[PDB]
Amino acid sequence: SLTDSVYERLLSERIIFLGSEVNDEIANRLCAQILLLAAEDASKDISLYINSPGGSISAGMAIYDTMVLAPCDIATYAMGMAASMGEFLLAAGTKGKRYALPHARILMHQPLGGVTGSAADIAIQAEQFAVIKKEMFRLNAEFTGQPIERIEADSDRDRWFTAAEALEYGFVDHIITR
Amino acid sequence: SLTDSVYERLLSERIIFLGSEVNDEIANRLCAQILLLAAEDASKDISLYINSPGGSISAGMAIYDTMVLAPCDIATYAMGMAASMGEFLLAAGTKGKRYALPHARILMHQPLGGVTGSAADIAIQAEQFAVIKKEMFRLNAEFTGQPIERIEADSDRDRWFTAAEALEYGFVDHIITR
Amino acid sequence: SLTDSVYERLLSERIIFLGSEVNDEIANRLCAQILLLAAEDASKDISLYINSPGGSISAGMAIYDTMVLAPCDIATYAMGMAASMGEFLLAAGTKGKRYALPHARILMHQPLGGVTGSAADIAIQAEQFAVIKKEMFRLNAEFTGQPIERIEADSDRDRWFTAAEALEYGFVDHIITRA
Amino acid sequence: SLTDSVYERLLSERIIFLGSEVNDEIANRLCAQILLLAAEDASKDISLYINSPGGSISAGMAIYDTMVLAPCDIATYAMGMAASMGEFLLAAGTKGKRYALPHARILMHQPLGGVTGSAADIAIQAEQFAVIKKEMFRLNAEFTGQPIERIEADSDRDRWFTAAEALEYGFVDHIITR
Amino acid sequence: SLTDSVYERLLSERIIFLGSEVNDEIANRLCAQILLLAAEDASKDISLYINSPGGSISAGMAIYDTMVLAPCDIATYAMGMAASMGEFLLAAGTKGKRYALPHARILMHQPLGGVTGSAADIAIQAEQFAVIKKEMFRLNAEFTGQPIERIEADSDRDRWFTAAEALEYGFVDHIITR
Amino acid sequence: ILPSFIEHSSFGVKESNPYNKLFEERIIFLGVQVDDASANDIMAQLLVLESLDPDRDITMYINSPGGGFTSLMAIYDTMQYVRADIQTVCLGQAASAAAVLLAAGTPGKRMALPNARVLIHQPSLSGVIQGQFSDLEIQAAEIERMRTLMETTLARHTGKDAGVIRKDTDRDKILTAEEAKDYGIIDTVLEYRKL
Amino acid sequence: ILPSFIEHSSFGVKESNPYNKLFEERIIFLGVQVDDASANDIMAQLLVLESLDPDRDITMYINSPGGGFTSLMAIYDTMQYVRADIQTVCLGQAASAAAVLLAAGTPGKRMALPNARVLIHQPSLSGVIQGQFSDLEIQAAEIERMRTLMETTLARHTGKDAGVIRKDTDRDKILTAEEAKDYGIIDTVLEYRKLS
Amino acid sequence: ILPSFIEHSSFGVKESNPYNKLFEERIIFLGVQVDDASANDIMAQLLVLESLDPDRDITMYINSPGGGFTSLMAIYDTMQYVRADIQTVCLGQAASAAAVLLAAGTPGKRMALPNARVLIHQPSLSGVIQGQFSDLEIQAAEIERMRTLMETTLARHTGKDAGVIRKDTDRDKILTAEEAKDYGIIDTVLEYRKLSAQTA
Amino acid sequence: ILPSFIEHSSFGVKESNPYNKLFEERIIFLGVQVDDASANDIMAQLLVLESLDPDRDITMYINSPGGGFTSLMAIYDTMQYVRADIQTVCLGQAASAAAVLLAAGTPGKRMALPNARVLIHQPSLSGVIQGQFSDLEIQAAEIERMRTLMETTLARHTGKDAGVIRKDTDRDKILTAEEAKDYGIIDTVLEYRKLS
Amino acid sequence: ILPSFIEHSSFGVKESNPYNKLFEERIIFLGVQVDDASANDIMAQLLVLESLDPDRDITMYINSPGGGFTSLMAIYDTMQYVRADIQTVCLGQAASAAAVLLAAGTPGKRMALPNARVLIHQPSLSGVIQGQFSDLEIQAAEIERMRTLMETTLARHTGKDAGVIRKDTDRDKILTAEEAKDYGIIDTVLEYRKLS
Incomplete structure (x- = not known):
């Protein structure tokens, strides 16, 4: 399949794409690809191109953990847009090898979700939000080098970064040019 | 097909995925895969990566029985999310070889369902709920090492576990870090 | 196709699945598979794994007759769930070679259906229900070893069986196990 | 697949198409293609045929950055229609090697979009519009050679160019004929 | 794919079909095919069978320019129906090598479209209609050999031609009987 | 649109519909499809008319x-x-x-x-x-049962045999007014009274 | 379409429906499906009729x-x-x-x-x-509970045993007017009063 | 379908519904689901009835x-x-x-x-x-807050402890009229007033 | 379902709703969602009430x-x-x-x-x-502008600073009747008048 | 929900809405979106009011x-x-x-x-x-034509130049009441006239 074939050929060059909304489905494929590439050559870098509007945290953490546990380094390229989980994963790239393309946009914000059931059920959901909010912030703080308080504050509502700004905030190590 | 091809290559490495809602359809394929892998090499481990929100008990038990009856060991990895049947199946992995990825979430709760017909029909459904509730608890108790009374109590409503907490509850043997 | 490919490889190991609602479509494929396997090696067993909620009687009887007419034996495994037609087909496996997985559930009940049309048309449909109900019971009685009167009575409404109970009732010959 | 097979054969001739609305999906595939072609032969030109009504800026900037960062030159052909992002990408082709087919139409205009949410959320979106509007104009200015004030003014509403007019405006270097 | 395979085999015989509504998608594929064929053998004719109800002008002009710019000749066969853009493209075949099948019907008429937006936006659309109407008439005049005044007049509403009439009007050079 | 009109008298002046004027004259109109709703309305009209004057038709x-x-x-x-x-x-x-x-x-x-x-x-x-x-x-x-009850009660009123009805109604049976009289479903066919 | 009509008297002249005239005579009509809405209407009618004249039927x-x-x-x-x-x-x-x-x-x-x-x-x-x-x-x-309450309250009024009702209603049970009388659901079957 | 009827008196002759006759007797009917619309109608009825005669029940x-x-x-x-x-x-x-x-x-x-x-x-x-x-x-x-306010205000009126209510309502709790009385939700259970069975 | 009722007097006998009786007593009911339609209805009621008696509340x-x-x-x-x-x-x-x-x-x-x-x-x-x-x-x-106008006009009536309102309303802010009084949104909290 | 009320007088007693009371006072309410339907209703009201008393405003x-x-x-x-x-x-x-x-x-x-x-x-x-x-x-x-007619007729009533209107309305133009007065769209801004 022409698109599949094109990605395939890139895949064999150790280049993977996160080009869409982050689902369980997309996550699983990515996680499989990182597993497969590590198992092939455990020494060479993997390049993760990211152009995603964000998505499922659960699904995003699958990718993140898979990244972290990989033996080889994982280089991350922000192309076009790296939003929300997309930003998180971009910033989770191995330090020194996180790149932004010059006109890419990065979007950091706090989690969204929903609340459903009995008051008891909701009490539980809420409790979990706390846990998650906290943890996601803790990690972005770690990635960026910013203090958790600034991550909390800045993440309160949509926070946009140009490649330039993203570099100075610490989402990214370099900006690519030529 | 690029995704199929990628899973295929992992499949030949004795790696299988439970990456979605647990249907009859998904369950069957998994059961087939475990059957096929056992029949190939009955001595080598199977690795079962789980990123699932839960699903059909009936379908889940097909997977569980297939796991148990397999000659070879079945290693279970909780990645991203192992919820409900997902948690169950994770915890059902061969003891010692049950892993959680560090930012995976585990969710334990009691069965949900529906009630449909004549009062007589419903009386019957209800009777079945009793049997099933009891049994699913009995088994989670067995897997975890907890007393059935605590499994009942904790399972009453959504019960969330971090990888850390899941280790100390007994859903999982190890947490991976490397 | 990854799932197709996986089933294929199992098919060549003489393993077939009834993993869904029983339609004409699903039935036909199964029937074709049993035909093909018999034609390949007419002496070796066929293994029929069943995880189905039930389905069309017409379509189910295609599978049943195809099973019975096969030269080779047909082993049946109840996995996860064998309900209604699923239970019937399970119990229709060649005697001695009918298995249940330990946490499989078996469901026996009487036929459901529908009635429509002119009073005359309905009179006919009804007559047919009698014939079918009778026959399906006769056969489950034969499979299980129970008396038709008990099959009628127990089948009146949803009747649930654990692997254990299914063994004693006669749907199944063995329960499988390891450790 | 007959269409896939036909594009494939062109792809191996270093010819790519932007023949539709510019999505994340279309953008990613184009970016992959430019990546793959550069990696194959880093010296030979790439020909980018454009017949598009426009699309996502984010997605378009992925293509644009991917174009700029490519080692090899990127020739751009406007066929049938190059509108909005389509025009932008056309005009972004490497200087000297930007072509229009004689009856192609070029359309330049300012960004469109949407506003939703809380007044605070909207304040933010608005801020972003300013940034983006500015930048897109800056770039079109650069491409065309026009002053940013004229790009602003002319872009205020739909601005239609024949091949002839586009040449004199500076979207394009040549018009092709025989 | 049986249909794909059949067209493929014809494609290798330098035979192409315009067998539907003229979209960006269809146009692109045709343009690619003409490009590919020219690049294969730049001397041999291409045969363009047309059975189309018409379509997008923009898209049609992509095909037209691609036809004109091709090194080789382009023979056009009107089969069943050549309407609107379909008639235009038929008539745009290289002079002398434009054919009608004996019971084919040809339909000439003026452009259809739509108007929306602010009064200012509409003013612009309208201006553009003028430009386009004029040029499409100019070109049909050129193809047929008729005066633009008659093309304008005849095109005002649906104008139907039998193969016979189409020959005398100048849409077509020959009628095929054999 | 269904007009109403007014009736003069020495006693007073009353507004009515055609349907009401019809009912005033002990005529009940059965014009819709006999759904459960309409049937109640018919029965009620019947019962009320009886209550108002049990001797009149x-x-x-x-x-x-x-x-x-x-x-x-x-x-x-x-x-x-x-x-x-x-x-x-x-x-x-x-x-x-x-x-x-x-x-x-x-x-x-x-x-x-x-x-x-x-x-x-x-x-x-x-x-x-x-x-x-x-x-x-x-x-x-x-x-x-329902079927045979229809046949019984038609038989009662038509003077036909129940089994004959069943035969004749097995499939649809269309009757002109004349035919319907012959069949015993109506007694007379109204002739026009024009002058 | 449901006609209204007018009633003469020496006191005055009143407009009414068939349903109203029925109600004027202490007759409540239960014709729809017993949804929560209709039920309230039936209760209110009952309660009102009692309030208007507690002795009359x-x-x-x-x-x-x-x-x-x-x-x-x-x-x-x-x-x-x-x-x-x-x-x-x-x-x-x-x-x-x-x-x-x-x-x-x-x-x-x-x-x-x-x-x-x-x-x-x-x-x-x-x-x-x-x-x-x-x-x-x-x-x-x-x-x-609901089920057994239906059976209790039928048993009360039919003079049958609750367990018998349950046996008989396990499946649908259809009764002619005669059968219904035998069953103890009604007391009498109305005979037609046609004068001819 | 809901009939109306007329009431005789020496003062005049008035038309009313059952619901209106009920309201005339200071009875407010709460029969629908308590949506925002219906609630206003109930409050207005209550407020009006008070305004018409503050002493009567x-x-x-x-x-x-x-x-x-x-x-x-x-x-x-x-x-x-x-x-x-x-x-x-x-x-x-x-x-x-x-x-x-x-x-x-x-x-x-x-x-x-x-x-x-x-x-x-x-x-x-x-x-x-x-x-x-x-x-x-x-x-x-x-x-x-809303949850605990329900529990508070039930507690107030039932005589039960708020924490007990919370426990008893964690899941659905169904009460017969008798049980409801015991629970302290109603005071009395109405006995039928039929004149015919009054011989008992 | 919303009953109407009748009011006796030596002058005559009048029919009314609760909502009308409420209005008769210079009470306007604001119960729906404030759509453009309803708002007109509220304004008209306000304007009419003023026109009917400009001194009364x-x-x-x-x-x-x-x-x-x-x-x-x-x-x-x-x-x-x-x-x-x-x-x-x-x-x-x-x-x-x-x-x-x-x-x-x-x-x-x-x-x-x-x-x-x-x-x-x-x-x-x-x-x-x-x-x-x-x-x-x-x-x-x-x-x-609309946002800051809300903040201005609340500030005017609550006695709070506009900028403080903005901080407090950036996210949703829920107030009990007591809290609302403290906030300066209402003056008094009604106590029940039950005779017992 | 829109209440009605009753007006006392020595002549007689009349029932009315707010909208009717408003109209009685020669006030026409323009509250919906000006669809073809509503426009006819506005015109008819205008025409009828003129017919009833051509001198009054x-x-x-x-x-x-x-x-x-x-x-x-x-x-x-x-x-x-x-x-x-x-x-x-x-x-x-x-x-x-x-x-x-x-x-x-x-x-x-x-x-x-x-x-x-x-x-x-x-x-x-x-x-x-x-x-x-x-x-x-x-x-x-x-x-x-329609566009330029809007501009003409605004120009007529605002005292502005038609071309200026066009420029100002090319995009949306929002005016506070004060601004609207400056622009020549209204003459005066109503001050609140409440007693405290």
Whole structure:
């Protein structure tokens, strides 16, 4: 399949794409690809191109953990847009090898979700939000080098970064040019 | 097909995925895969990566029985999310070889369902709920090492576990870090 | 196709699945598979794994007759769930070679259906229900070893069986196990 | 697949198409293609045929950055229609090697979009519009050679160019004929 | 794919079909095919069978320019129906090598479209209609050999031609009987 | 749009519809499909008219494509039950259930206009009743009863044999006003009274 | 379309419906399906008729395919509760819930027209109630109660044993007017009063 | 279909409904689901009845499957607020919110017909509230408040401990009229007043 | 279902609703969501009441989940504009726009029942406004104005600082009747008047 | 829900709405979107009021988000045409078409409440008009005429130059009541007239 074939050929060059909304489905494929590439050559870098509007945290953490546990380094390229989980994963790239393309946009914000059931059920959901909010912030703080308080504050509502700004905030190590 | 091809290559490495809602359809394929892998090499481990929100008990038990009856060991990895049947199946992995990825979430709760017909029909459904509730608890108790009374109590409503907490509850043997 | 490919490889190991609602479509494929396997090696067993909620009687009887007419034996495994037609087909496996997985559930009940049309048309449909109900019971009685009167009575409404109970009732010959 | 097979054969001739609305999906595939072609032969030109009504800026900037960062030159052909992002990408082709087919139409205009949410959320979106509007104009200015004030003014509403007019405006270097 | 395979085999015989509504998608594929064929053998004719109800002008002009710019000749066969853009493209075949099948019907008429937006936006659309109407008439005049005044007049509403009439009007050079 | 009008008198001045003026004259109009809702309305009108004057005749104008069997029987029982004689008049069509009703008027008093049309047929169930066989067999039984009750009660009023009705209604049976008289469904065919 | 008419008198001249005229004569019509809405209307009518004249009889005309259980009981309680005697008359069908109501008229005063039809059956739930098992077990329990309450209150009024009712209603049970009398659901079957 | 009728008197002749005749006798009917619309209608009726005669009792007939929490509280506050005593009478069902209202009548004057049914349960939200976590946390908080306010106000009227209510309502709790009386939700269970069975 | 009733007097006998009786007593009911339609109805009622008797007080009963900003301001302007004093009474909820209105009653005369609830929050736009950026920037601007106007006019009536309102409303802010009094949205919290 | 009320007098006792009472006082309410239906209702009201008393003033209360152009003009022509002076009062919003109407009241008599809002913009067509180019060109033409007619008639009533209007309305133009006065759309801004 022409698109599949094109990605395939890139895949064999150790280049993977996160080009869409982050689902369980997309996550699983990515996680499989990182597993497969590590198992092939455990020494060479993997390049993760990211152009995603964000998505499922659960699904995003699958990718993140898979990244972290990989033996080889994982280089991350922000192309076009790296939003929300997309930003998180971009910033989770191995330090020194996180790149932004010059006109890419990065979007950091706090989690969204929903609340459903009995008051008891909701009490539980809420409790979990706390846990998650906290943890996601803790990690972005770690990635960026910013203090958790600034991550909390800045993440309160949509926070946009140009490649330039993203570099100075610490989402990214370099900006690519030529 | 690029995704199929990628899973295929992992499949030949004795790696299988439970990456979605647990249907009859998904369950069957998994059961087939475990059957096929056992029949190939009955001595080598199977690795079962789980990123699932839960699903059909009936379908889940097909997977569980297939796991148990397999000659070879079945290693279970909780990645991203192992919820409900997902948690169950994770915890059902061969003891010692049950892993959680560090930012995976585990969710334990009691069965949900529906009630449909004549009062007589419903009386019957209800009777079945009793049997099933009891049994699913009995088994989670067995897997975890907890007393059935605590499994009942904790399972009453959504019960969330971090990888850390899941280790100390007994859903999982190890947490991976490397 | 990854799932197709996986089933294929199992098919060549003489393993077939009834993993869904029983339609004409699903039935036909199964029937074709049993035909093909018999034609390949007419002496070796066929293994029929069943995880189905039930389905069309017409379509189910295609599978049943195809099973019975096969030269080779047909082993049946109840996995996860064998309900209604699923239970019937399970119990229709060649005697001695009918298995249940330990946490499989078996469901026996009487036929459901529908009635429509002119009073005359309905009179006919009804007559047919009698014939079918009778026959399906006769056969489950034969499979299980129970008396038709008990099959009628127990089948009146949803009747649930654990692997254990299914063994004693006669749907199944063995329960499988390891450790 | 007959269409896939036909594009494939062109792809191996270093010819790519932007023949539709510019999505994340279309953008990613184009970016992959430019990546793959550069990696194959880093010296030979790439020909980018454009017949598009426009699309996502984010997605378009992925293509644009991917174009700029490519080692090899990127020739751009406007066929049938190059509108909005389509025009932008056309005009972004490497200087000297930007072509229009004689009856192609070029359309330049300012960004469109949407506003939703809380007044605070909207304040933010608005801020972003300013940034983006500015930048897109800056770039079109650069491409065309026009002053940013004229790009602003002319872009205020739909601005239609024949091949002839586009040449004199500076979207394009040549018009092709025989 | 049986249909794909059949067209493929014809494609290798330098035979192409315009067998539907003229979209960006269809146009692109045709343009690619003409490009590919020219690049294969730049001397041999291409045969363009047309059975189309018409379509997008923009898209049609992509095909037209691609036809004109091709090194080789382009023979056009009107089969069943050549309407609107379909008639235009038929008539745009290289002079002398434009054919009608004996019971084919040809339909000439003026452009259809739509108007929306602010009064200012509409003013612009309208201006553009003028430009386009004029040029499409100019070109049909050129193809047929008729005066633009008659093309304008005849095109005002649906104008139907039998193969016979189409020959005398100048849409077509020959009628095929054999 | 259905006009109303006013009636002069020495006593006072009253507003009424055609349907009300009709009812004032002991005429009940059966024009819709005999759904459970409409049937109650008919029964109530019947019962009320009896209560208002038990000796005077009630007349029932029928132009109905038919309707529910359960309703048919309820209306019928009410028609027969009230003290007053019932005069049935088919104006356009009396189909299905409506046919039985037409037929069920008091003997001597069943009529139709000349190009009226009477259609009889056995009970159908369009749409499907779903269920366990045990439930469906009970249902089927109840439907055979319903069928034979239609045949019984038509037989009673037409002077035909129940078995003959069953034969004639196995399939649809269309009757002109004349034919309907012959069949024993109406007594007389109205002739026009024009001057 | 339901006509209205006018009634002469020396006192004045009044406009009324058939349904109103029926109500003026202490007759309440139970013709729709017994939804929560209709039930309130029936109760209110009952309560009002009692308030207007507690000694005189209330009559209840029944042609209903049945209805909600929660509503059934409420209507029932109101029927029994008011000071006045209740006369129940099945015209057409008294099915499901409507059957119990028919049965629940004051003894001696329960009637049906001859081709009337009474159907009894146990409570069904078409549509599905979704939930955690804990919730569903509570629900199921409540439904068993509801069921056995239907059987209790029929048993009370029919003179039958509760367990017998349960046997007979396990599946649908259809009764002719005669059969219904035998069963103890009605007291008398109305004979036609035609003068001819 | 709901009939109207006419009432004779030496003063004049008036047309009314059952619902109007009921209201004329200071009876307010609570029969729908307690949506924001219906609640206003109930409050207005209560307020008006008070304004018409502050000393005489208001009776509230209840057969309601329940309803909105925000509405529940408004109705409640109005019930308690007006000068007049409130008599609550459960005719069929008083579920959810309707249960609290039933319970919230003036002590001594809370009733139910014998096969009436009272159901209490904690507040649910069917359907989903979507949002940023910050918004949701606020929401959740407000819901815990709403929950504990239901428990408080039931406790007040039943004589039970708030914590006990919470336990008993964690899941659905169904009460017969008798059970409801025991629970302290109604005071008396109405016995039938039929004149014929009065010989017992 | 909303009953009507009749009022005796030596002058004559009149029919009315609860809502009409309420209006007769200079009470306007604000119970729906403040859509453009309803707002006109409120303004008209206010204007009419002033015209009927400019010295006597108008009272506004509020149980509303909120509503349109353009409407909020119109109603507000009208409330303030009429000669008569405005008494605001929150009965259940006064959310969003309704809150501002509650607050905007004449000082001294703003009330709530004890379990009433007041919610304030900044203006949202669910649903999307589509457009060219030039059009959207104009729009956004107008929304910032609208926001700061809400904050101004609350500040005016609560005695709080505009900037403080903005901080407090950045996210949703829920107030009990007591809290609402503290916040300066209402003056008094009504105590029950039960004779017992 | 919109209450009605009754008016005492020595002559007799009459029932009315707020909207009727308003109309009784020669006030026409323009509150919906100016669709073809509503426009006819406004014209008829205007015409009827003139017929009833041609010397006394008619007042028009405006809170409208705008509406159809063809309707705008009709209403406008009728406003200007009738003998009586027209007083226009913007209560909330007067947007689009409504803005022109507000402006088109008789000079001296055009008003707004202080937080009222006036929005002007050129004619839009959301939704698409489909057609042959010949048809579309005729259409486009007519729409330029319609546009320039809006600009002419505003110019007439604001004292501004038509070309200036065009420039100012090329994009949306939002006006506070004060700004609207400066722009020449209203004459005075109503001050609140409350006793405290």
